[PDB]
Design a protein around this ligand. Structure first.
Ligand SMILES: COC1=C(OC)C(=O)C(C/C=C(\C)CC/C=C(\C)CC/C=C(\C)CC/C=C(/C)CC/C=C(\C)CC/C=C(\C)CC/C=C(\C)CC/C=C(/C)CCC=C(C)C)=C(C)C1=O
Ligand SMILES: CCCCCCCCCCCCCCCCCC(=O)O[C@@H](COC(=O)CCCCCCCCCCCCCCC)COP(=O)(O)OCC[N+](C)(C)C
Ligand SMILES: CCCCCCCCCCCCCCCCCC(=O)O[C@@H](COC(=O)CCCCCCCCCCCCCCC)COP(=O)(O)OC[C@H](O)CO
Ligand SMILES: CCCCCCCCCCCCCCCCCCCC(=O)O[C@H](COC(=O)CCCCCCCCCCCCCC)COP(=O)(O)OCCN
Lengths: 58, 98, 64, 92, 138, 324, 90, 488, 39, 55
């Protein structure tokens, strides 16, 4: 079978789209410890600010 | 939705059935209401007929005028019937049945 | 003054406005309700708190 | 809230810089009228979509009244679009 | 400082709008005005209108102008000494906080709905007037 | 806070390489259909050919006419490339693998899609050629016309979800993908994206020397390269959007077997690959539309039908109270 | 100061639009885009005032002004198109 | 859920009838079976029928239109004044539509969209009279303005129409921008837009203790916009050109219906504009300037429609006199003058459209009309004398009671200027009578007879004008009830 | 009515399909919803 | 002339792109088939003894 030869560039673009997706995760977790959170409304940002304050005072 | 039907000028006559239903006021059409709902439709149909003889739209203009007149006449009949029901019109025919 | 809030809770200056409107609804003259009207107008854009704080800052700065 | 737009702005700046350097590298080495009508049609339906966005999101809060108040708007502009259709503004 | 530079750039672009010689440059600066005022709206708090300005003014109106032009040619004084942490936040309103779209569509289509239909009639009038004036079908 | 440009570069560079390799991918998978092999002499199987093209365009010093305007004729490809790249800031990959977690993501995507019309208008006028200007204007008109169909299909998707957040839409497809109920909407969206990016049976920009010659007829190596990169990035972006709305963005097929515990970042990739394969298949399957019937089609087959789909979905959800 | 930097900016935009519409009898394009600049200034006024005092009667009217401005621009360009077919004067 | 719509009930019918007319006129004006018929007289007659039907619907339901007023409170409030204004606006629109029928046949101007746009403008005006807000008012103003811009330049291949349409467009957009700036800058300083909540926080306190620059400036901007809409000096930059260039049936409708709605808006605004130092003096000065400029500018005019435009401007000044008083009698004089001026303008434009058959352009064309058509000559002379305020006619009662209201407030300077301008205007009014009864030029122009619509409207209006001072009680009573209903 | 309807449908399948879909979407909350709400 | 049974089939076919998926599936049959091109530097095309080339 030979049709996999044309699927090689498709595999390259798929895997490298994958690494494009995973790059913003393996380094966001690096310098924030915890990954990104989908959401982050007013309550969530208030909770993050309060956590920062309490850890700073602790 | 929060709705509140209330007239600033209160009904002068008996105020039976403050908020009637659509099919109820439709079924309350007296002989006068049918008569005035029919005369408007007839006038509209004949005006649509007479107007549409120069352009050559002999019949479809009559149909369009009939639609306009039918809607207007039904609107007028509904308005009169409902206004009679909420009270602020001379009823003398609804308190008799109520 | 209408009630609907930006965040969808309630107008910030709606309680004052409704108090002023209710009091002025059964008041013949409008000079008895100017006590509340000024309060509501100030709550809109802080026409007196800002003056007070600015005067505090100016009299603190004039210590030089 | 708006703190999610700072990455977008910085991304725009970096994209501008990359695009600039991409073309900076090689240096180191008669009147028609249908267009205007279709543009107005796009403007009208773009306003339609702009109004659609708040409606779809806030559709569970308002039931059987907001839906019909939007359908009336759709009916009015559908009558307008039908009038555009017959008047020869869609086919060339 | 972000507000002042953005406003100054917007003002310069607007001044160039009413002074540019060829209409194309004026239209492009006109686009730039919306481009840099959408950010001003965005940093004010409103995200929906910031995008609507891009979608409508420089998505529909400005492209219309382009098509036409291509042819036919008592403050609070700064006091951070003791006014940086007096902000009394209330957590009662933080739970179930509506975005811009939700709290606008709550009452655009339900309470003030006639003005919505009047706007619809305005759009229909514009649509009708745009074809009874500019049409040479053949 | 200095690590944000690291994320931005990790988004940009793989995406530029993805466009470069997608060019080879289409030139090979289209050649295999026509009993050919495509470029297989430069690299292993042409895997070095995009590098050769890029280096050749880096060399071969630009001609740079710039007869009308030095700035606009040079700024337009920059603008279109920026617009092509900037819409990737909101696309979510698996869960937190998203640059900006906007709450207006669909509106942002709509604005970016509608804002790319200038890149082929100012570029078209800047070149002093009637055949370039008129063709670019017509292509802009086509994209503007299909923009409303794109928006209406987006509203159709938004009705079921209930929020403009892109990451929330995929989480809304836990039960079933949106391609199952409203499949015809998916077909219409795919065809509109084909028309939006000037690809497959709508690509009059590459109509050789007919009434439409293209907005990039007279461009140097790098300006033409920037336009080419930008519109292929648009192709990738629209395939990703089509597979994120009506298909699970990262969700497994039916998660019945045990081997579906693999990372979700590759499900998105294989779905995007499937849609790219459909793009290329449709390109090398059908002939082209003339511009007159393309406009009529886009205004009389996709606008009323998308409007009807909006109305039907909204009515069905409201009737049975199946609302988010 | 934050509300002042918004209101003054909007007012100066409005005055600049007034200037643009009242400095040339010819050049219909900029005289008609000055109207759009004026509408932008008043729209920004509405939005800023709505946000400043926490009321949603400025945002609704701000959004509704979009349609009026768009329709005015469309009708203006229609008249401008039809005025060349008779006069041809820039 | 359906009985709440009896308040906005007539407007629903007129909108639906407009949609039906549009659908009919677009379906049957393109069919090859009927080889593209004109389809303008048909749509005009159907639109006149629809206007009459909605007038009947509005008039009969007088006790209606008030139910569910709390539900409609945030959107529009229609009290007794709104009902009486709308029932008159519909009558004026129907009169204009019936007038502009022979123009659709002899001129051969078969565009059915004309009547549809007139109907849409009528609905916008209906929404405007009851617009009890700072948002609905602007929306309705724009809704009528768009239709007016479109139908002003309806005749495309002509040159005066398109140019006048463009100038009207620019002036209207500029006026709307100013008005919207004023509305925004009074909303931001008060926090309220609804008229109930706007007449409650500034009615008892205007400049007494102190003042706010924003609210005063916004009130001034609103007044400037409203004066621009009614074309009052000096905010009349291009109105005579608009009257010239616009097609005569359009300017017949452009000078009667819009003024009524805009003056209703001004009256409804006056109930909260209780400053007395920002609205009365500006309108006083503008009234004086408008009378002076109209009287001294229509003297030199040799055309017909230019003279009518300047006479309308002068009448707007006299009208503003009655509003400057700011009393019950002032508003009564205002409304009486508006009614009389509307009837007389209908009369004059019926004459002009009658003489449009042979393309009358200048004042001298109608010379020697006392012999060819003596009856039309005497009718037009009666119309001119009614404009002059000659006592034994309508048009003198309005100016009479206007001056009486002006003396009620003790504005003696207004009375003298009114007298001087009345004399000057009477001179150039009787100048027309001279040109067509006394002077007999060598060359005569013959005018073909008119149709039954214009003739019947003309006869009714001419009998109303002459025989009005024998039975004027109903108009006085209804205008006093309207003025008294403005506040309670 | 059955003779012109099929002629119209044959010429414009897309418009007929759109009309049917919109009619269903407007028919569901106008008839099914009021009767379904009463159980 | 139509019988309410053929117009349904014709409208559906023109609405679901059946005649387009026919060609779409046709174009894919040679995708997996063996190719025909020749590696020119190594294997060359078949000539004839009568070929006219360089003198
Ligand atoms: C339609 O006609 C055309 C073609 O035929 C299809 C072309 O092939 C082409 C060829 C264009 C290309 C090959 C674009 C490729 C450009 C590049 C690879 C250079 C830019 C890419 C980068 C800077 C990213 C590289 C960095 C990484 C991969 C980081 C790794 C981690 C053009 C321009 C064209 O116009
Ligand atoms: C119910 C839907 C509501 C919404 C509808 C919106 C429609 C708005 C626009 C209305 C357009 C109406 C077009 C329909 C007319 C189509 C043609 C037609 O049906 O009339 C026929 C036939 O019509 C008639 O003959 C009589 C018309 C019926 C009049 C009876 C009274 C009016 C009807 C009452 C109201 C109508 C209610 C309709 C149902 C609600 C035409 O015959 P002719 O062309 O004149 O004859 C041939 C001419 N020639 C020999 C030269 C070839
Ligand atoms: C209130 C009245 C409502 C009814 C009005 C019906 C609409 C009338 C349209 C008339 C306009 C028209 O179409 O023009 C024709 C004129 O239409 C008419 O002649 C009469 C139309 C009908 C009017 C009579 C109907 C009576 C019914 C009234 C209500 C009862 C053309 O006339 P002609 O070309 O034949 O002129 C030459 C003439 O014959 C030589 O003398
Ligand atoms: C106040 C004291 C003075 C007032 C005195 C009033 C006296 C009462 C009224 C008297 C009325 C007499 C009418 C006699 C019956 C005539 C019937 C003829 C009707 C008719 O012929 O139909 C059409 C004529 O249009 C028409 O005749 C109908 C359209 C007429 C337009 C009138 C519009 C009324 C609404 C607005 C009025 C103004 C209100 C201002 C406040 C066609 O005509 P055709 O058969 O000859 O053929 C076409 C020729 N073109």
């Amino acid at each position: 079978l030979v049709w996999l030869e044309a699927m090689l560039p498709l595999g390259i673009i798929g895997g490298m789209l994958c690494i494009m997706g995973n790059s913003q995760y393996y380094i966001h977790k690096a310098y924030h410890g915890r990954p990104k959170h989908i959401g982050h409304d007013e309550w969530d940002v208030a909770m993050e600010r309060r956590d920062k304050k309490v850890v700073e005072k602790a | 939705m929060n709705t509140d039907i209330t007239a600033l000028e209160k009904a002068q006559y008996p105020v039976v059935d403050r908020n009637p239903a659509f099919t109820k006021v439709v079924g309350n059409f007296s002989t006068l209401d049918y008569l005035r709902f029919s005369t408007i439709t007839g006038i509209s149909v004949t005006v649509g007929y007479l107007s549409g003889i120069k352009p050559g739209i002999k019949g479809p203009s009559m149909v369009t005028g009939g639609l306009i007149g039918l809607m207007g006449g039904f609107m007028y009949a509904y308005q009169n019937s409902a206004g009679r029901l909420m009270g602020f019109f001379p009823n003398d025919g609804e308190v008799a049945s109520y | 003054a209408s009630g609907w809030g930006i965040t969808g809770n309630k107008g910030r200056c709606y309680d004052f406005w409704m108090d002023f409107s209710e009091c002025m609804s059964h008041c013949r003259e409008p000079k008895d309700c100017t006590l509340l009207r000024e309060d509501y107008l100030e709550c809109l854009h802080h026409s007196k708190e800002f003056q007070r704080r600015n005067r505090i800052y100016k009299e603190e700065q004039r210590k030089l | 809230m708006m703190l999610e737009f700072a990455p977008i702005f910085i991304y725009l700046v970096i994209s501008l810089l990359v695009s600039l350097i991409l073309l900076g590298v090689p240096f180191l080495f008669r009147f028609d009228i249908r267009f205007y009508l279709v543009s107005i049609l796009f403007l009208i339906f773009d306003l339609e979509v702009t109004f659609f966005f708040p409606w779809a999101v806030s559709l569970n809060k308002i039931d059987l009244f907001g839906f019909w108040s939007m359908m009336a708007f759709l009916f009015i502009l559908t009558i307008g679009f039908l009038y555009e259709w017959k008047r020869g503004a869609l086919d060339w | 400082m972000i507000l002042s530079v953005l406003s100054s750039l917007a003002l310069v672009s607007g001044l160039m709008v009413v002074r540019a010689k060829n209409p194309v440059h004026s239209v492009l600066f006109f686009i730039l005005v919306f481009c840099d005022t959408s950010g001003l709206l965005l940093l004010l708090g409103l995200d929906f209108f910031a995008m609507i300005f891009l979608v409508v003014y420089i998505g529909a109106i400005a492209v219309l102008f382009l098509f036409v032009v291509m042819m036919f040619h008592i403050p609070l004084l700064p006091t951070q000494r003791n006014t940086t942490s007096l902000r009394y936040t209330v957590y009662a309103g933080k739970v179930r906080s509506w975005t811009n779209l939700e709290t606008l569509g709550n009452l655009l289509y339900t309470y003030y709905f006639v003005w919505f239909l009047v706007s619809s009639l305005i759009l229909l009038v514009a649509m009708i007037g745009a074809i009874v004036l500019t049409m040479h079908r053949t | 806070y200095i690590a944000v440009p690291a994320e931005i570069l990790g988004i940009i560079l793989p995406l530029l390489l993805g466009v470069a390799f997608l060019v080879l991918a289409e030139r090979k998978v289209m050649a295999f259909v026509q009993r050919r092999k495509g470029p297989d002499v430069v690299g292993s199987f042409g895997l070095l050919q995009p590098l050769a093209d890029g280096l050749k365009l880096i060399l071969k010093e630009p001609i740079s006419p710039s007869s009308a305007n030095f700035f606009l004729f040079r700024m337009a490809p920059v603008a279109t490339f920026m617009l092509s790249l900037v819409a990737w800031a909101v696309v979510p990959f698996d869960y937190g693998m998203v640059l900006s977690d906007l709450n207006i993501g669909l509106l942002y995507l709509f604005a970016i899609s509608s804002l790319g019309v200038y890149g082929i208008i100012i570029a078209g006028r800047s070149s002093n050629s009637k055949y370039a200007f008129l063709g670019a204007l017509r292509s802009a008109a086509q994209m503007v016309s299909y923009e409303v169909s794109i928006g209406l299909i987006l509203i159709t998707v938004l009705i079921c979800v209930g929020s403009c957040n892109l990451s929330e839409i995929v989480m809304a497809q836990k039960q079933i993908w949106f391609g199952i109920p409203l499949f015809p909407v998916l077909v219409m969206f795919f065809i509109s994206c084909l028309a939006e990016t000037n690809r497959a049976p709508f690509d009059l920009p590459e109509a050789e020397a007919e009434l439409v010659a293209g907005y990039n007829v007279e461009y140097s190596s790098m300006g033409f390269a920037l336009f080419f990169l930008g519109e292929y990035a648009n192709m990738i972006l629209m395939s990703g959007l089509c597979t994120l709305f009506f298909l699970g963005g990262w969700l497994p097929i039916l998660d019945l077997p045990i081997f579906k515990k693999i990372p979700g970042s590759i499900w998105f990739s294989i779905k995007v690959l499937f849609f790219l394969f459909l793009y290329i298949w449709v390109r090398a399957a059908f002939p082209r539309y003339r511009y007159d019937q393309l406009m009529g089609l886009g205004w009389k087959v996709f606008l009323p039908l998308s409007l009807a789909w909006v109305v039907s979905v909204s009515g069905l959800l409201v009737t049975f109270q199946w609302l988010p | 100061m934050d509300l002042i930097k918004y209101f003054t900016f909007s007012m100066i935009i409005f005055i600049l639009g007034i200037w643009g519409i009242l400095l040339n009898r010819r050049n219909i394009l900029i005289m008609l885009m000055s109207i759009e600049l004026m509408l932008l200034a008043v729209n920004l006024n509405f939005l800023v005032f709505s946000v400043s005092l926490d009321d949603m009667m400025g945002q609704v009217f701000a959004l509704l002004v979009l349609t009026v401005a768009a329709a005015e621009s469309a009708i203006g360009l229609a008249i401008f198109v039809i005025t060349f077919r008779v006069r041809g004067t820039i | 859920m359906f009985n709440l719509f009896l308040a906005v009930f007539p407007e629903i019918f007129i909108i639906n009838a407009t949609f039906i007319l549009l659908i009919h006129g677009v379906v049957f004006s393109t069919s090859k079976k009927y080889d593209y018929p004109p389809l303008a007289s048909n749509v005009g007659w159907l639109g006149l029928l629809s206007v009459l039907i909605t007038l009947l619907l509005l008039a009969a339901g007088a006790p209606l239109l008030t139910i569910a007023h709390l539900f409609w409170n945030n959107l529009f409030r229609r009290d007794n004044f709104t009902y009486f204004c709308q029932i008159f606006l519909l009558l004026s629109t129907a009169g204009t539509i019936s007038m502009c029928f022979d123009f659709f046949d002899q001129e051969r101007f078969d565009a059915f969209e004309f009547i549809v746009l007139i109907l849409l403008s009528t609905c916008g005006m209906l929404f405007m009279i009851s617009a009890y807000d700072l948002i609905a008012m602007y929306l309705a103003i724009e809704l009528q303005s768009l239709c007016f811009y479109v139908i002003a330049a309806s005749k495309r291949k002509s040159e005066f129409s398109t140019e006048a349409g463009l100038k009207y467009l620019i002036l209207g957009a500029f006026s709307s921008g100013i008005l919207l700036f004023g509305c925004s800058m009074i909303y931001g300083s008060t926090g309220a837009t609804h008229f109930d909540q706007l007449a409650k926080i500034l009615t008892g306190y205007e400049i007494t203790g102190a003042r706010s620059s924003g609210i005063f400036m916004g009130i001034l901007f609103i007044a400037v916009g409203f004066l621009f809409k009614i074309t009052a000096v000096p905010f009349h930059m291009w109105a005579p050109d608009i009257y010239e260039g616009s097609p005569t049936p359009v300017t017949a409708f452009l000078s009667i219906a819009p003024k009524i709605s805009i003056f209703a808006n001004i009256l409804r605004v006056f109930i909260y504009g209780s400053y007395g130092a920002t609205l009365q003096q500006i309108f006083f000065f503008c009234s004086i300037a408008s009378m002076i400029l109209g009287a001294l500018a229509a003297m030199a005019q040799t055309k017909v429609k230019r003279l009518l435009a300047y006479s309308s401007i002068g009448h707007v000044g006299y009208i503003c006199i009655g509003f400057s008083c700011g009393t019950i009698e002032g508003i009564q004089s205002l409304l009486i003058g508006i009614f009389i001026y509307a009837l007389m303008t209908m009369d004059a434009f019926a004459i002009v459209l009658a003489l449009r058959q042979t393309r009358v352009k200048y004042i001298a064309d109608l010379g020697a009309l006392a012999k060819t058509n003596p009856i039309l000559a005497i009718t037009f002379s009666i119309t001119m004398f009614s404009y002059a305020g000659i006592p034994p006619l309508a048009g003198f009662c309005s100016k009479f009671y206007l001056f009486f209201a002006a003396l009620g407030c003790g504005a003696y300077f207004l009375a003298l200027v009114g007298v001087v301008t009345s004399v000057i205007g009477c001179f150039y009014y009787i100048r027309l009578v001279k040109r067509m009864f006394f002077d007999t030029p060598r060359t005569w122009i013959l005018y073909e007879p008119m149709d039954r619509n214009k003739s019947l409207l003309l006869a009714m209006t001419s009998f109303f004008i002459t025989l009005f001072l024998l039975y004027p009680s109903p108009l006085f009573s209804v205008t006093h009830q309207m003025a008294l209903s403005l506040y309670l | 009515v059955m003779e012109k309807l099929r002629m119209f449908v044959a010429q414009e399948p897309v418009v007929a399909a759109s009309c049917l879909i919109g009619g269903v979407g407007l028919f569901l909350p106008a008839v099914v919803r009021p009767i379904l709400d009463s159980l | 002339s139509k019988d309410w049974n053929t117009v349904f089939e014709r409208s559906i076919n023109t609405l679901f792109l059946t005649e387009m998926v026919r060609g779409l599936s046709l174009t894919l049959k040679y995708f997996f088939d063996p190719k025909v091109t020749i590696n020119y530097p190594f294997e060359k095309g078949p000539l004839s003894p009568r070929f006219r080339g360089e003198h």
